Design a protein around this motif. Structure first.
Motif, mmCIF file in Angstrom:
data_model
loop_
_atom_site.group_PDB
_atom_site.id
_atom_site.type_symbol
_atom_site.label_atom_id
_atom_site.label_comp_id
_atom_site.label_asym_id
_atom_site.label_seq_id
_atom_site.Cartn_x
_atom_site.Cartn_y
_atom_site.Cartn_z
ATOM 1 N N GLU A 7 0.812 -1.201 0.000
ATOM 2 C CA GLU A 7 0.000 0.000 0.000
ATOM 3 C C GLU A 7 0.852 1.260 0.000
ATOM 4 O OE1 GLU A 7 -2.741 0.145 3.283
ATOM 5 O OE2 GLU A 7 -2.880 2.327 3.135
ATOM 6 N N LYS A 8 1.881 1.271 0.834
ATOM 7 C CA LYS A 8 2.764 2.422 0.927
ATOM 8 C C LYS A 8 3.457 2.718 -0.405
ATOM 9 N N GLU A 9 3.535 1.703 -1.258
ATOM 10 C CA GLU A 9 4.199 1.829 -2.552
ATOM 11 C C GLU A 9 3.270 1.872 -3.758
ATOM 12 O OE1 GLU A 9 7.241 2.466 -2.790
ATOM 13 O OE2 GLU A 9 8.544 1.233 -1.524
ATOM 14 N N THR A 10 1.969 1.727 -3.537
ATOM 15 C CA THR A 10 1.023 1.743 -4.645
ATOM 16 C C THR A 10 -0.361 2.241 -4.243
ATOM 17 O OG1 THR A 10 0.462 -0.573 -4.226
ATOM 18 C CG2 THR A 10 2.184 -0.119 -5.850
ATOM 19 N N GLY A 11 -0.496 2.649 -2.987
ATOM 20 C CA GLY A 11 -1.780 3.127 -2.513
ATOM 21 C C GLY A 11 -2.803 2.014 -2.580
ATOM 22 N N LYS A 12 -2.316 0.794 -2.802
ATOM 23 C CA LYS A 12 -3.176 -0.382 -2.904
ATOM 24 C C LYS A 12 -3.353 -1.149 -1.589
ATOM 25 C CE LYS A 12 -2.261 -1.464 -7.751
ATOM 26 N NZ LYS A 12 -2.536 -2.373 -8.886
ATOM 27 N N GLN A 13 -4.605 -1.232 -1.149
ATOM 28 C CA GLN A 13 -4.971 -1.945 0.073
ATOM 29 C C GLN A 13 -5.346 -3.391 -0.256
ATOM 30 O OE1 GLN A 13 -5.985 1.700 2.490
ATOM 31 N NE2 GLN A 13 -7.874 0.493 2.502
ATOM 32 N N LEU A 14 -4.320 -4.189 -0.542
ATOM 33 C CA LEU A 14 -4.495 -5.593 -0.899
ATOM 34 C C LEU A 14 -4.130 -6.572 0.213
ATOM 35 C CD1 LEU A 14 -2.987 -5.746 -4.504
ATOM 36 C CD2 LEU A 14 -5.402 -5.688 -3.872
ATOM 37 N N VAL A 15 -4.589 -7.811 0.046
ATOM 38 C CA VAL A 15 -4.311 -8.882 1.000
ATOM 39 C C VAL A 15 -3.545 -10.021 0.308
ATOM 40 C CG1 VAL A 15 -5.406 -10.828 2.152
ATOM 41 C CG2 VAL A 15 -6.097 -8.491 2.711
ATOM 42 N N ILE A 16 -2.388 -10.382 0.875
ATOM 43 C CA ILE A 16 -1.548 -11.447 0.318
ATOM 44 C C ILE A 16 -2.229 -12.794 0.459
ATOM 45 C CG2 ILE A 16 0.591 -12.751 0.519
ATOM 46 C CD1 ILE A 16 1.549 -9.918 1.910
ATOM 47 N N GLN A 17 -2.316 -13.503 -0.659
ATOM 48 C CA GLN A 17 -2.950 -14.804 -0.686
ATOM 49 C C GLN A 17 -1.968 -15.955 -0.679
ATOM 50 O OE1 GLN A 17 -6.437 -14.806 -3.518
ATOM 51 N NE2 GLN A 17 -5.443 -12.833 -3.900
ATOM 52 N N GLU A 18 -0.752 -15.710 -1.151
ATOM 53 C CA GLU A 18 0.260 -16.755 -1.161
ATOM 54 C C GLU A 18 1.657 -16.162 -1.162
ATOM 55 O OE1 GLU A 18 -0.567 -18.716 -5.198
ATOM 56 O OE2 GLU A 18 1.341 -17.688 -5.605
ATOM 57 N N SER A 19 2.613 -16.932 -0.660
ATOM 58 C CA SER A 19 4.006 -16.517 -0.624
ATOM 59 C C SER A 19 4.783 -17.738 -1.063
ATOM 60 C CB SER A 19 4.443 -16.120 0.792
ATOM 61 O OG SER A 19 3.624 -15.108 1.340
ATOM 62 N N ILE A 20 5.353 -17.685 -2.260
ATOM 63 C CA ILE A 20 6.107 -18.820 -2.793
ATOM 64 C C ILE A 20 7.609 -18.582 -2.616
ATOM 65 C CG2 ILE A 20 6.450 -20.299 -4.813
ATOM 66 C CD1 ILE A 20 3.576 -20.246 -3.753
ATOM 67 N N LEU A 21 8.340 -19.652 -2.338
ATOM 68 C CA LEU A 21 9.772 -19.553 -2.137
ATOM 69 C C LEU A 21 10.466 -19.837 -3.456
ATOM 70 C CD1 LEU A 21 12.326 -19.484 -0.239
ATOM 71 C CD2 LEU A 21 11.994 -21.974 -0.009
ATOM 72 N N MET A 22 11.355 -18.935 -3.873
ATOM 73 C CA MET A 22 12.095 -19.105 -5.128
ATOM 74 C C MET A 22 13.588 -18.794 -4.984
ATOM 75 S SD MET A 22 9.665 -18.103 -8.245
ATOM 76 C CE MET A 22 7.904 -18.271 -8.278
ATOM 77 N N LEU A 23 14.416 -19.652 -5.587
ATOM 78 C CA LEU A 23 15.875 -19.523 -5.538
ATOM 79 C C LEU A 23 16.397 -18.388 -6.425
ATOM 80 C CD1 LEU A 23 16.642 -23.331 -5.487
ATOM 81 C CD2 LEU A 23 15.385 -21.866 -3.906
ATOM 82 N N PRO A 24 17.599 -17.877 -6.131
ATOM 83 C CA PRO A 24 18.209 -16.774 -6.888
ATOM 84 C C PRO A 24 18.276 -16.872 -8.413
ATOM 85 C CG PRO A 24 19.455 -17.214 -4.887
ATOM 86 C CD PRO A 24 18.476 -18.347 -5.046
ATOM 87 N N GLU A 25 18.394 -18.083 -8.946
ATOM 88 C CA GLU A 25 18.482 -18.267 -10.395
ATOM 89 C C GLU A 25 17.116 -18.142 -11.042
ATOM 90 O OE1 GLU A 25 19.335 -21.284 -8.437
ATOM 91 O OE2 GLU A 25 21.112 -20.168 -7.781
ATOM 92 N N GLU A 26 16.102 -18.673 -10.362
ATOM 93 C CA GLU A 26 14.731 -18.601 -10.857
ATOM 94 C C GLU A 26 14.345 -17.131 -11.019
ATOM 95 O OE1 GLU A 26 12.769 -21.244 -7.711
ATOM 96 O OE2 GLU A 26 11.768 -21.881 -9.564
ATOM 97 N N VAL A 27 14.501 -16.370 -9.933
ATOM 98 C CA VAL A 27 14.186 -14.946 -9.905
ATOM 99 C C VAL A 27 15.103 -14.149 -10.820
ATOM 100 C CG1 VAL A 27 13.694 -12.984 -8.386
ATOM 101 C CG2 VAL A 27 13.587 -15.301 -7.501
ATOM 102 N N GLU A 28 16.374 -14.548 -10.914
ATOM 103 C CA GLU A 28 17.336 -13.841 -11.766
ATOM 104 C C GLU A 28 16.904 -13.898 -13.215
ATOM 105 O OE1 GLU A 28 21.622 -15.200 -12.736
ATOM 106 O OE2 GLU A 28 20.296 -15.021 -14.485
ATOM 107 N N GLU A 29 16.190 -14.966 -13.533
ATOM 108 C CA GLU A 29 15.681 -15.183 -14.867
ATOM 109 C C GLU A 29 14.684 -14.088 -15.209
ATOM 110 O OE1 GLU A 29 12.986 -18.781 -15.943
ATOM 111 O OE2 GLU A 29 14.996 -19.199 -16.725
ATOM 112 N N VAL A 30 13.528 -14.137 -14.563
ATOM 113 C CA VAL A 30 12.464 -13.169 -14.804
ATOM 114 C C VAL A 30 12.881 -11.737 -14.484
ATOM 115 C CG1 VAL A 30 10.076 -12.527 -14.265
ATOM 116 C CG2 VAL A 30 10.732 -14.935 -14.301
ATOM 117 N N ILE A 31 13.132 -11.468 -13.209
ATOM 118 C CA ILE A 31 13.527 -10.130 -12.788
ATOM 119 C C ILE A 31 14.778 -9.693 -13.545
ATOM 120 C CG2 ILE A 31 14.120 -8.641 -10.835
ATOM 121 C CD1 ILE A 31 11.327 -9.705 -10.708
ATOM 122 N N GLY A 32 15.597 -10.663 -13.941
ATOM 123 C CA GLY A 32 16.813 -10.337 -14.661
ATOM 124 C C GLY A 32 17.901 -9.858 -13.722
ATOM 125 N N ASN A 33 17.610 -9.868 -12.426
ATOM 126 C CA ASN A 33 18.559 -9.443 -11.398
ATOM 127 C C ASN A 33 18.669 -10.543 -10.346
ATOM 128 O OD1 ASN A 33 19.616 -6.350 -11.120
ATOM 129 N ND2 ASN A 33 19.787 -7.463 -9.175
#
Lengths: 82, 223
Positions: A7-33
């Protein structure tokens, strides 16, 4: 609670439904970082604008904010380094 | 005719396992809200017997929100909003199986009754904090479970989405069971290969081609 960070970063009052665990290479792929450790992808869905807002924090019990990603119905995401 | 109890009797009492239960129980006692409720904690094994395992889908830990988790990987309680990764799973099934249509609910019991073991690597979580009970001793337990199915069964299908799941896959003998991997259905990686992996279909073909009845992937609400 990482909803307030969302919310503080998008003014969006949302509720988290899931939190998935992902390794550095997986995320490095998409995010590219490559994170230094496993990041958790807390995912909330903004029905109003039909997009999937995800917050990327380190693993428990750190839970430090690493990046926020807003993907739309197209499958394209707006990545914002925090 | 081999029950989870037959292969899990010993482990049910070793150190770590009782410690883990003790730990999880103490937090509850001091006033910490842990999900899911215990009666549900071992639902995956309640619904799917050792002898009835056909397909196996790996999870991480329980939905930390309220009303959400009920003992089955990915599956939520009826009335609860379909989680992002489950919804994506649904799309695939829509796009791969003819006639399949979005359920409007995320209750996956019928999948378990058919032989699908929706097992989460970690079985409990502290309401609010995702991954809170990692290193509590659960991985060791489920780790063993996988090793039991791998050694006491033949022709089982393993659906490992994401690096984390695939890692536990290292145990499974690829000659004895059908191991299929793919990126997590998570919106983040869904489009990077999860969409169009045809897993639900490849899983059924193998089953038929092995004289086994397939899996009606359409989730039904019991009564």
């Amino acid at each position: 609670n990482l909803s307030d960070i969302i919310e503080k970063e998008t003014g969006k009052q949302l509720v988290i439904q899931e939190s998935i665990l992902m390794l550095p290479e997986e995320v490095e792929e998409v995010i590219g970082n490559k994170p230094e450790s496993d990041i958790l992808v807390h995912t909330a869905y903004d029905e109003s604008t039909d997009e999937n807002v995800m917050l990327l924090t380190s693993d428990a019990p750190e839970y430090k904010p690493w990046a926020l990603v807003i993907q739309d119905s197209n499958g394209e995401n707006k990545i914002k380094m925090l | 005719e081999l029950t989870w109890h037959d292969v899990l009797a010993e482990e049910k009492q070793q150190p770590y396992f009782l410690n883990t239960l003790q730990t999880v129980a103490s937090e509850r006692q001091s006033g910490v809200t842990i999900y899911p409720p215990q009666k549900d904690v071992f639902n995956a094994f309640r619904f799917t017997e050792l002898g009835d395992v056909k397909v196996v889908i790996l999870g991480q830990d329980p939905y930390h929100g309220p009303g959400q988790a009920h003992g089955l990987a990915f599956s939520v309680r009826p009335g609860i909003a379909i989680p992002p990764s489950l919804l994506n799973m649904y799309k695939e099934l829509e796009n791969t199986i003819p006639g399949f249509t979005r359920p409007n609910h995320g209750y996956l019991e019928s999948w378990a009754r058919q032989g699908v073991l929706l097992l989460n690597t970690v079985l409990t979580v502290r309401a609010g904090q995702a991954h809170s009970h990692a290193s509590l001793g659960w991985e060791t337990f489920t780790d063993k479970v996988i090793s039991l199915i791998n050694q006491h069964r033949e022709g089982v299908v393993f659906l490992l989405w994401g690096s984390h799941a695939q890692k536990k896959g290292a145990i499974i003998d690829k000659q004895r069971h059908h191991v299929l991997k793919a990126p997590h259905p998570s919106p983040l990686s869904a489009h990077r290969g999860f969409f169009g992996c045809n897993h639900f279909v490849l899983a059924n073909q193998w089953l038929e081609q092995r004289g086994e009845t397939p899996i009606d992937w359409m989730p039904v609400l019991p009564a």
